[PDB]
Every structure is written in C-alpha cells, then in structure tokens.
Ligand binder design. Structure first.
Ligand SMILES: CCn1nc(Cl)c2c1-c1cnc(N)c(c1)O[C@H](C)c1cc(F)ccc1-c1nn(C)cc1C2
Length: 304
C-alpha cells in the first residue's frame, strides 16, 4: 500500500484524528463475493459475506488506478468508519492489504432510494404499495442523518436520492445516507459532474459550503421523494437550472404534494442561507406533517 503508506493522510471528524491504522482490517480469507450489483463511477460493487455470516456490500478499488484514486478510496474508508448514527450506513471494515482493495458496508436490502421510489410507485398491480406516511418516514430518516452531520460540523455536499439506501423494501424500512464521495473529493482538494440541480446559489457561484448547503440539497431530495423518483427540474439542463435558480426560479410541487410538505421545500430553497431552516427545524416540520390527517390521507398518484 505504498501510496496510502507514504502519504498516510490524517482524517479529522468531530475534532478526532484517525488514520489508515484505525480502520478494521478484515482478513481477506473471511470475505466471499456473492454477486455483482453493477458499478458506480469508479470500481465495482458486490453483495458479499464476512465470517450466520455478516451480509455486506463490497465496494472495490480497480487495480488499474491512479495515486489519487488510492487516496480517494482511503479517505472514503476513514469518513464512513468514523460516523456512528442509525441513519448513516455502517462500515463493517476494509480489506486494504489485498488486491483489489475492499470497503465493507452494511448490505441495504431495500437498495438505493431513487430505484426504490421508481419501482415501488403505486400502480394497478399494487394500489397501496406506498402512502404519504412512508414518504414522510424516509424524509425524517434522512433529515435525522443530516442533523447528526450538522451537529458534528460535517457538510455532505450531495444530499440526493441516488446517495440514500433503504434497509428493506417493505414496512419497517429505514432510510440512510449511503455515499460520501463528494465530501471525500473536497477533503482531498469539472462542472459537468457537479450535482448543480442539488446546489444552492452560493455553492455553484462562490464555492461556499456550510450546513445550509445541505438544507438546500435536502429540499431537492424532498422533491425527489414526493415526486416518487423524478429527476429534479424536469426538461432543464445544468446551465438552465443554474440560470433559473440564480434568478429566483423554484420547482413546482410534485403531483398531489400536500401544501405543508411543499412549504418545507420552499423554506429549504430560500436564496439567503440564513433564511433556510437548520435540520432541527426541518425535523420538527416533518414531524408536524406526519401528525396532520390532511397530509397523510392524501392519495399518491397511481402510475398507469
Ligand atoms: C441490495 C444490494 N444493492 N442493490 C442495489 Cl441496486 C444497491 C445495493 C446496495 C446495498 N447496500 C449498499 N451498502 C450498497 C448498495 O452500497 C453502494 C456503494 C451504494 C451506495 C449508495 F449510497 C447508493 C447506491 C449504491 C449502489 N451502487 N450500486 C452499483 C448499486 C447500489 C444500490
């Protein structure tokens, strides 16, 4: 591990330092790959087992990779390993002393939130598959994770449905923040890869990131949730969104979205960061919506 060894990056979370030394190295002989889950931008993801063996998701580092790719992978390992919260995916450990290198994560049987929403959309095949309360529970779960990050001074920078996972498809599902790749890239120090549709004006104009960055992104996630997994700003390109948002344009409510839920989105999208709610206030507003019969009795649209 010459690149990881020679540099040995520090990682600082909640004012505690950690290094490669602190990662739980799992012996490679204890790790079995079961199936491919596809690939991200870089590296494959597998279902695997560690040892009633632990069910894991295995993120792999390609053996053909840059010095920068190696440190990026190490940083991702340190970031996820240092979190302790019910709404952030657990890291079981790593296997960095064998090739390809592995990060071992909690297997989230519900898969990514974006896929979950698109595939669990109410249909004639399943009329009451999902209700307004299920969506408010997903929103609460991710807001709880976001509140944990906020109170530990960690800025996620890409709160989006694509970066969230579900413990299971059925009732009792818990949503968690599952990917920290954007946070990893900045810690390490083009525009067509920036998640501009999730970014407030000060982020894409000035490169200014605060916890009010995540508040804005959470508003967009709420839209993704209540739309049942539509792409934000339907039919707009990245530059069209940049111009629309920087000129005060905001998304319309999703189909059948209750007013109280839409109002949480519109507060998340205040132009000035100081006018946006912190995650404690977002959680309170989500909790009030879950109490309101006129919210939770609202029918979701049935896709034909
Ligand atoms: C039931 C397995 N499964 N199936 C699907 Cl689809 C997915 C998962 C799965 C389950 N758990 C975990 N931890 C997991 C994946 O982690 C990865 C790194 C991840 C993390 C994320 F925040 C978002 C997406 C993915 C992901 N990437 N790819 C290629 C697929 C998936 C989803």
């Amino acid at each position: 591990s010459t690149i990881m060894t020679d540099y040995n990056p520090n990682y600082c979370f909640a004012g505690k330092t950690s290094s490669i030394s602190d990662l739980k190295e799992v012996p490679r002989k204890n790790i079995t790959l079961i199936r491919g889950l596809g690939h991200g931008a870089f590296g494959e993801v597998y279902e695997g087992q560690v040892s009633s063996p632990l069910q894991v998701a295995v993120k792999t580092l390609p053996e053909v990779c840059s010095e920068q790719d190696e440190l990026d992978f190490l940083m991702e390992a340190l970031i996820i390993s240092k979190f302790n919260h019910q709404n952030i995916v657990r890291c079981i450990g790593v296997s960095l002393q064998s090739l390809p290198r592995f990060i071992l994560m909690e297997l989230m049987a519900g898969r990514d939130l974006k896929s979950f929403l698109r595939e669990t959309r109410p249909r004639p095949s399943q009329p009451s598959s999902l209700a307004m309360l299920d969506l408010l529970h997903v929103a609460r779960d991710i807001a709880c994770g976001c509140q944990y990050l906020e109170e530990n001074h960690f800025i996620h920078r890409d709160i989006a449905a694509r970066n969230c996972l579900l413990t299971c498809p059925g009732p009792g599902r818990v949503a968690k923040i599952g990917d920290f790749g954007m946070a990893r890239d900045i810690y390490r120090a083009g525009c067509a890869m920036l998640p501009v549709k999730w970014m407030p004006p000060e982020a894409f104009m000035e490169g200014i990131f605060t916890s009010k960055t995540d508040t804005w992104s959470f508003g967009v996630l709420l839209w993704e949730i209540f739309s049942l997994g539509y792409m934000p700003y339907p039919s707009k390109s990245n530059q069209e969104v940049l111009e629309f948002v920087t000129s005060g344009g905001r998304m319309d409510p999703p189909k059948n979205c209750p007013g109280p839920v839409y109002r949480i989105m519109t507060q998340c999208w205040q132009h000035q960061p100081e006018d946006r709610p912190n995650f404690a206030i977002i959680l309170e507003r989500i909790e009030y919506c879950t109490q309101d019969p006129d919210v939770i009795n609202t029918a979701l649209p049935i896709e034909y």
